[PDB]
Amino acid sequence: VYRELGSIVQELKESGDKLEERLTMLSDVNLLSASKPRSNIDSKDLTSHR
Amino acid sequence: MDEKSTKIIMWLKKMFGDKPLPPYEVNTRTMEILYQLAEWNEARDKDLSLVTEDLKLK
Numbered sequence: 152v153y154r155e156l157g158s159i160v161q162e163l164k165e166s167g168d169k170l171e172e173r174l175t176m177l178s179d180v181n182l183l184s185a186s187k188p189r190s191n192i193d194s195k196d197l198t199s200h201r
Numbered sequence: 202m203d204e205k206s207t208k209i210i211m212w213l214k215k216m217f218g219d220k221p222l223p224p225y226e227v228n229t230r231t232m233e234i235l236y237q238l239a240e241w242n243e244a245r246d247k248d249l250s251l252v253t254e255d256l257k258l259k
Binding site for chain 2: 197198201
């Protein structure tokens, strides 16, 4: 009984960890919709600087 | 006149590289023309460099 419950807890834990990882990824600011273009030209935008 | 003259001589040295600068009549008019030309070339060279780098990126 102890081995069986142990397996169920592990499966739930692995699923829980994977979900947290995905949520963290989806909350990345660069992925989030059309923030109003930045008013300042990004240092990485070489064309606008030129 | 002494500053414009220096700019012209430096510019001519840059353009003619390792070749001895040819002797020319240094008068007020020849210096003005050379000076306008030097300013124009410098401004265009800058513009062309920026365009060339951008085209590489594109």
